[PDB]
Amino acid sequence: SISISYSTTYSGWTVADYLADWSAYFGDVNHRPGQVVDGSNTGGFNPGPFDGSQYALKSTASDAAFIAGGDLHYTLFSNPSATLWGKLDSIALGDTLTGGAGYALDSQEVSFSNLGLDSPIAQGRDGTVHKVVYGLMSGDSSALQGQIDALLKAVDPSLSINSTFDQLAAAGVAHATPA
Ligand code: HEM
Ligand SMILES: [Zn+2]
Ligand SMILES: [Zn+2]
Ligand SMILES: [Zn+2]
Ligand SMILES: [Zn+2]
Ligand SMILES: [Zn+2]
Ligand SMILES: [Zn+2]
Ligand SMILES: [Zn+2]
Ligand SMILES: [Zn+2]
Ligand SMILES: [Zn+2]
């Protein structure tokens, strides 16, 4: 079942409000045709170069960053091209990316783990893993939100992305860490 870690700063926040805030502050890195710049808005894999247990990306607007964890593969130019696929077990959100091939966030705000998301290569860019991560890269947490909402309801059908982190802690899903 999904497990969430949150800084006590966010106890009274809803998951949706947190995600919409973080995504707006991270912004859109403009990873799209004609706009990809190696070393600026590609992010990186650990161990990489195009596969690993982590994919991490820093904002180009702010100090926000995220780390996706699991078993992740990027097809680059191979068919189906520009597809991230594999198993997505976790998403960590916060600021100030450190490390590398592991990555960590200096300020880890919220992490969602045991996501259990998996997308085979055959689904291409329509895979859930691709859509969740590419959404974050593009300033849009909607895909992530939809997956979190379904996972929460699978544990306890009255929970949702409009639950506060404290409500999720009372339901046994979330765990606070010191600010
Ligand atoms: C090491 C990391 C990455 C590198 C070096 C990389 C490189 C590139 C390059 C060079 C392009 C431009 C290709 C073109 O438009 O012809 C591109 C486009 C794209 N990338 Fe990435 N990328 C990386 C990570 C990712 C990740 C993690 C995702 C998804 C979660 C992704 C999704 C896309 C998408 C959807 C496009 C547009 C594809 C198209 O329109 O043909 N990329 N990438
Ligand atoms: Zn955009
Ligand atoms: Zn192209
Ligand atoms: Zn694999
Ligand atoms: Zn493998
Ligand atoms: Zn922050
Ligand atoms: Zn599957
Ligand atoms: Zn219930
Ligand atoms: Zn109930
Ligand atoms: Zn706990």
CSV table of N, CA and C in Angstrom, one decimal, residues 1-5 13-16 19 111-115 117 144-165 167-169 171-175:
chain,number,residue,atom,x,y,z
A,1,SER,N,0.8,-1.2,0.0
A,1,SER,CA,0.0,0.0,0.0
A,1,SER,C,0.9,1.2,0.0
A,2,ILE,N,0.4,2.3,-0.6
A,2,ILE,CA,1.1,3.6,-0.6
A,2,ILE,C,1.5,4.0,0.8
A,3,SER,N,2.7,4.6,0.9
A,3,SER,CA,3.2,5.1,2.1
A,3,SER,C,3.7,6.5,1.8
A,4,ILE,N,3.4,7.5,2.7
A,4,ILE,CA,3.7,8.9,2.5
A,4,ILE,C,4.6,9.4,3.7
A,5,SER,N,5.7,10.1,3.4
A,5,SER,CA,6.5,10.8,4.4
A,5,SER,C,6.3,12.2,4.1
A,13,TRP,N,-1.8,20.7,5.4
A,13,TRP,CA,-2.0,20.9,4.0
A,13,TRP,C,-2.7,19.7,3.4
A,14,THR,N,-3.5,19.9,2.4
A,14,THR,CA,-4.0,18.8,1.6
A,14,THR,C,-3.0,18.3,0.6
A,15,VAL,N,-3.0,17.1,0.2
A,15,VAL,CA,-2.1,16.6,-0.8
A,15,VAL,C,-2.2,17.4,-2.1
A,16,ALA,N,-3.4,17.7,-2.5
A,16,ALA,CA,-3.6,18.4,-3.8
A,16,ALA,C,-3.0,19.8,-3.7
A,19,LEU,N,0.8,19.5,-3.8
A,19,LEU,CA,1.3,19.2,-5.2
A,19,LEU,C,1.2,20.4,-6.2
A,111,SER,N,7.3,12.7,0.3
A,111,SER,CA,7.6,11.6,-0.6
A,111,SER,C,6.5,10.6,-0.6
A,112,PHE,N,6.2,10.0,-1.8
A,112,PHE,CA,5.2,9.0,-2.0
A,112,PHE,C,5.9,7.7,-2.4
A,113,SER,N,5.8,6.7,-1.6
A,113,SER,CA,6.5,5.4,-1.9
A,113,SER,C,5.5,4.3,-1.9
A,114,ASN,N,6.0,3.1,-2.4
A,114,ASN,CA,5.2,1.9,-2.6
A,114,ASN,C,4.1,2.3,-3.6
A,115,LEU,N,4.4,3.0,-4.7
A,115,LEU,CA,3.4,3.4,-5.6
A,115,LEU,C,2.9,2.3,-6.4
A,117,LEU,N,3.5,1.4,-9.5
A,117,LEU,CA,3.2,1.8,-10.8
A,117,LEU,C,4.1,1.1,-11.8
A,144,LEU,N,0.2,12.6,-11.6
A,144,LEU,CA,0.6,12.1,-10.3
A,144,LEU,C,-0.6,12.1,-9.3
A,145,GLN,N,-1.3,13.2,-9.2
A,145,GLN,CA,-2.5,13.3,-8.3
A,145,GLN,C,-3.5,12.2,-8.5
A,146,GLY,N,-3.8,11.9,-9.8
A,146,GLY,CA,-4.8,10.9,-10.1
A,146,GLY,C,-4.4,9.5,-9.6
A,147,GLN,N,-3.1,9.2,-9.7
A,147,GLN,CA,-2.6,7.9,-9.2
A,147,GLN,C,-2.5,7.9,-7.7
A,148,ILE,N,-2.2,8.9,-7.1
A,148,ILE,CA,-2.1,9.0,-5.6
A,148,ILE,C,-3.6,8.8,-5.1
A,149,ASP,N,-4.5,9.5,-5.7
A,149,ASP,CA,-5.9,9.4,-5.3
A,149,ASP,C,-6.4,8.0,-5.3
A,150,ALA,N,-6.1,7.3,-6.4
A,150,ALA,CA,-6.6,5.9,-6.5
A,150,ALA,C,-5.9,5.0,-5.5
A,151,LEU,N,-4.6,5.2,-5.2
A,151,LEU,CA,-3.9,4.4,-4.2
A,151,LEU,C,-4.4,4.6,-2.8
A,152,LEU,N,-4.7,5.8,-2.5
A,152,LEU,CA,-5.3,6.2,-1.2
A,152,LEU,C,-6.7,5.5,-1.0
A,153,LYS,N,-7.5,5.6,-2.0
A,153,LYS,CA,-8.8,5.0,-1.9
A,153,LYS,C,-8.8,3.4,-1.8
A,154,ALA,N,-7.7,2.9,-2.4
A,154,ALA,CA,-7.5,1.4,-2.3
A,154,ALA,C,-7.3,1.0,-0.9
A,155,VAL,N,-6.6,1.9,-0.1
A,155,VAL,CA,-6.4,1.6,1.3
A,155,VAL,C,-7.7,1.9,2.2
A,156,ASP,N,-8.2,3.0,2.0
A,156,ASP,CA,-9.4,3.5,2.7
A,156,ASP,C,-10.2,4.3,1.8
A,157,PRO,N,-11.4,3.9,1.4
A,157,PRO,CA,-12.2,4.6,0.4
A,157,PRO,C,-12.6,6.0,0.7
A,158,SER,N,-12.5,6.4,2.0
A,158,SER,CA,-12.9,7.8,2.3
A,158,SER,C,-11.7,8.8,2.1
A,159,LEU,N,-10.5,8.3,1.9
A,159,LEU,CA,-9.3,9.2,1.7
A,159,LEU,C,-9.3,9.7,0.3
A,160,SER,N,-8.6,10.7,0.1
A,160,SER,CA,-8.5,11.3,-1.3
A,160,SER,C,-7.3,12.3,-1.3
A,161,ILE,N,-7.1,12.8,-2.5
A,161,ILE,CA,-6.0,13.8,-2.6
A,161,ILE,C,-6.4,15.1,-1.9
A,162,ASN,N,-7.7,15.3,-1.5
A,162,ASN,CA,-8.1,16.4,-0.7
A,162,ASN,C,-8.0,16.2,0.8
A,163,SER,N,-7.5,15.0,1.2
A,163,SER,CA,-7.2,14.7,2.6
A,163,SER,C,-5.9,15.5,3.0
A,164,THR,N,-5.9,15.9,4.3
A,164,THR,CA,-4.6,16.6,4.7
A,164,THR,C,-3.6,15.5,5.1
A,165,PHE,N,-2.3,15.9,5.2
A,165,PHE,CA,-1.3,14.9,5.6
A,165,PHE,C,-1.6,14.4,7.0
A,167,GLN,N,-4.6,14.0,8.3
A,167,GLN,CA,-5.7,13.0,8.1
A,167,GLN,C,-5.1,11.6,7.6
A,168,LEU,N,-4.1,11.7,6.7
A,168,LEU,CA,-3.5,10.5,6.2
A,168,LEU,C,-2.7,9.8,7.2
A,169,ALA,N,-2.1,10.6,8.1
A,169,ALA,CA,-1.3,10.0,9.2
A,169,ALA,C,-2.3,9.3,10.2
A,171,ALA,N,-4.9,7.9,9.4
A,171,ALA,CA,-5.4,6.7,8.7
A,171,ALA,C,-4.3,5.6,8.5
A,172,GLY,N,-3.1,5.9,9.0
A,172,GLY,CA,-2.0,5.0,9.0
A,172,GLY,C,-1.1,5.0,7.7
A,173,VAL,N,-1.4,5.9,6.8
A,173,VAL,CA,-0.8,5.9,5.5
A,173,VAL,C,0.5,6.8,5.5
A,174,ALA,N,0.4,7.9,6.2
A,174,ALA,CA,1.4,9.0,6.2
A,174,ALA,C,2.2,9.0,7.5
A,175,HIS,N,3.4,9.5,7.4
A,175,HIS,CA,4.4,9.5,8.6
A,175,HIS,C,5.1,10.9,8.6
